From a paper:
Tlde1a functions as an LD-carboxypeptidase to cleave tetrapeptide stems and as an LD-transpeptidase to exchange the terminal D-alanine of a tetrapeptide stem with a noncanonical D-amino acid. This includes an exchange pocket to bind a D-amino acid for exchange and a catalytic pocket to position the D-alanine of a tetrapeptide stem for cleavage.
Initial phases were obtained by single anomalous diffraction on a home source diffractometer using Tlde1a crystals soaked with sodium iodide. Tlde1a adopts a primarily β-sheet fold (blue) with the core of the domain comprised of a β-sandwich (β1-4 and β9-12) that is bounded on either side by α-helices (α2 and α3) (gold). Additionally, the Tlde1a structure is stabilized by two conserved disulfide linkages highlighted in magenta (C66-C86 and C37-C111). All three Tlde1a crystal structures included the His-tag of a symmetry mate bound in the Tlde1a active site as a crystal packing artifact. However, most of the peptide backbone interactions of the His-tag with Tlde1a are mediated by ordered water molecules or sulfates from the crystallization condition.
Author numbering:
A (entry chain C): 301 to 304
B (entry chain A): 3 to 174
Write the structure that this text describes.
């Protein structure tokens, strides 16, 4: 899970 | 043990104080959107990893990707260049990893959501995490640095109304  | 509560707008540390807090991207700050990617965090129970581990790991400098870590870490804002000045402003300066702490929470939303943190950006939104008033991290340090024993923190997320999950954390 990325958060960009 | 400390059981924090988060109702969409307020993060409560029982017996200590109430902190402004926000979850979800701007159009997704709603309890009924909590299974949409980057929306308000799903309701349930989460463990906080408050052990202070210093600078967060950088997984890919070119793409501004921070690696996951299970503790309290800092965001390397001082070296941000170009696009990472934008992207890391959405982290803030501090983040605390959250992990689902029971099966019901973990199975929420088909299990498709994750990577949750508490962090202290001042944007008024959060990419599927919980943005908290920065003073929370200063209270956390003060309340824990003099304690010698076990330090166990959880947060229960429970939205009791349809109100927007925005506690006014955008910088004034």
């Amino acid at each position: 899970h990325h958060h960009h | 043990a400390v059981r924090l509560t988060f109702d969409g707008q307020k993060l409560t540390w029982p017996g200590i104080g109430i902190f402004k807090a926000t979850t979800g991207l701007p159009d997704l700050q709603w309890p009924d959107k909590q299974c949409v990617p980057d929306a308000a965090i799903p309701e349930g129970n989460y463990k906080l990893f408050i052990q202070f581990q210093g600078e967060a790991p950088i997984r890919n400098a070119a793409d501004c990707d921070l690696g996951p870590s299970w503790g309290w870490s800092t965001i390397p804002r001082g070296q941000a260049a170009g696009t990472c000045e934008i992207y890391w402003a959405n982290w803030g300066y501090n983040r605390i990893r959250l992990e689902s702490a029971d099966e019901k929470t973990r199975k929420a939303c088909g299990g498709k959501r994750g990577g949750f943190y508490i962090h202290d950006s001042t944007k008024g939104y959060s990419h599927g995490c919980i943005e908290v008033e920065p003073v929370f991290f200063r209270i956390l340090k003060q309340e824990t640095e003099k304690e010698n024993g076990e330090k166990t923190f959880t947060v229960n997320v429970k939205y009791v109304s349809g109100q927007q999950t925005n506690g006014g954390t955008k910088q004034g």
